[PDB]
């Protein structure tokens, strides 16, 4: 009877960095995906292994929504078979994934003339991520594996920052991504 | 509550070569895929993009079954994203495929001590195949495209032969493949 709380994730005031992505579990509701693909709010709406039109004719146990933020040239890395720093170290999707990817430009809220460097992503890690694996540790990376703090030789900090100004192209502009993976049914 | 005509394809005495593969249309029936994987008749039973256990809870308009025969080393080419002569020129599957692949050894019925060369495959074509495209032409291939005489220079026949003996290993033995693409589950 009750409908799924989608606007709580889309009308959300604050979004986290990619490495600290968040997942909200959806259960015991009727999701009307018809209004979503027919809405121009999203510039990117990609569904893998299934067309969104047919989601209205399926039931599911639970639906998961991973919310995070990356720049444009790194939105394509949220995809099966894709490699790269965002896919290797921050958010990996399985090649047999079945779901949808949603994204839209947010230069209006995440870009400043001074530069909004609050958004960080991981560029160093010991081994890549499993699908849906989440490494939010912030211990200084080292090649030898032996823990070091200082900014001395062969010791680096693990997270790096996105630089979001207003002059950059859509490849460097912030996009807000929401990935979607018998209680949650169609109409 | 009509049943799908499955046994008519599996217990079939005659199977075609890969280049001339055949498709049996399934319609107006209830497909119970659960009973099939519980049978040891297939040595190879791989499903792509869906689990066979959940197929029992799905409806479809029509189901297509492509029957053909290749050797072992050429069974791996029957797969999405796979390349090779069988996939390039004989039977190409789409990378976004959703279905199952079935195979089993048939050395006992398709191999002879002299060599059973009735099974042929295409190794020359002008361009690769689209998904589910079927080229059963037997015109002497030429690079220039101009039709020529087959024993002439730069003029070859398009089909080659499988040699299926009893003395060869299981890599060279014939396997019988069936690919799966109102028709509901129970």
């Amino acid at each position, epitope marked *: 009877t009750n409908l799924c709380p989608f606007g709580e994730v889309f009308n959300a005031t604050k979004f986290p960095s990619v490495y600290a992505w968040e997942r909200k579990k959806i259960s015991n509701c009727v999701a009307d995906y018809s209004v979503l693909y027919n809405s121009t709010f999203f510039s990117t709406f990609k569904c893998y292994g299934v067309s969104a039109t047919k989601l209205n004719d399926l039931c599911f146990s639970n639906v998961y929504a991973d919310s995070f933020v990356v720049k444009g040239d790194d939105v394509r890395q949220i995809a099966p078979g894709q490699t790269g720093v965002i896919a290797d170290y921050n958010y990996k999707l399985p090649d047999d994934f079945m779901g949808c990817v949603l994204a839209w430009n947010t230069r209006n809220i995440d870009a400043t003339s001074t530069g909004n460097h609050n958004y960080k992503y991981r560029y160093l890690r010991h081994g890549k991520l499993r*699908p849906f694996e989440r490494d939010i540790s912030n211990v200084p990376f080292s090649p030898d594996g032996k823990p070091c703090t200082p900014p001395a030789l062969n010791c680096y900090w693990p997270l790096n920052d996105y630089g979001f100004y207003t002059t950059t192209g859509i490849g460097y502009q912030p996009y807000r991504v929401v990935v979607l993976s018998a209680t949650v049914c169609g109409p | 509550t009509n049943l799908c005509p499955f046994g008519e394809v599996f217990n079939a005495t005659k199977f075609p070569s890969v280049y001339a593969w055949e498709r049996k249309k399934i319609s107006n029936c209830v497909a119970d895929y659960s009973v099939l994987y519980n049978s040891t008749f297939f040595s190879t039973f791989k499903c792509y993009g*869906v689990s066979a256990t959940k197929l029992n809870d799905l409806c479809f308009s029509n189901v297509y079954a492509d029957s053909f025969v290749v050797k072992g080393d050429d069974v791996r080419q029957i797969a999405p994203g796979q390349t090779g002569v069988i996939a390039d020129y004989n039977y190409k599957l789409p990378d976004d495929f959703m279905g199952c692949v079935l195979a089993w050894n048939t050395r006992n019925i398709d191999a002879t001590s002299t060599g059973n060369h009735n099974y042929k495959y295409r190794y020359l074509r002008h361009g690769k195949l689209r998904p589910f495209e079927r080229d059963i032409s037997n015109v002497p291939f030429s690079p220039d495209g101009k039709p020529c005489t087959p024993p002439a220079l730069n003029c070859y026949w398009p089909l080659n032969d499988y040699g299926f003996y009893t003395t060869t290993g*299981i890599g060279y033995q014939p396997y019988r493949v069936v690919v799966l693409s109102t028709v509901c589950g129970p």
Partner: nanobody
Amino acid sequence: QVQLVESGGGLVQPGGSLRLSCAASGFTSDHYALAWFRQAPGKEREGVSCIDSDGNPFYADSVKGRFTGSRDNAKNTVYLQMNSLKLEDTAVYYCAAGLWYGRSLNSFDYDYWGQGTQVTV
């Protein structure tokens, strides 16, 4: 990339028991099927057992009723318990995976091979 690591092989006498473990490394997908293969010196690589994509396991007819294998999905480790050993079961045993839902092949046409762990009777 992907890596398969076998463990548990050793010298036994007939009638005994053995357990083999195998661990998978590269998880570029989630519904991988896992199987066990053996090959005697100068012989063709036989399919021993094949465990579904987190489902039911399947054994070859030559070892049915004698062997039992299965995996843990959380630990991504496949185990194979080999009861009632014989002398024909002597072979070099291999771990192999494959990227196909539910049931899968018994033939050698897989995608990822492990490393030969020797079992001697």
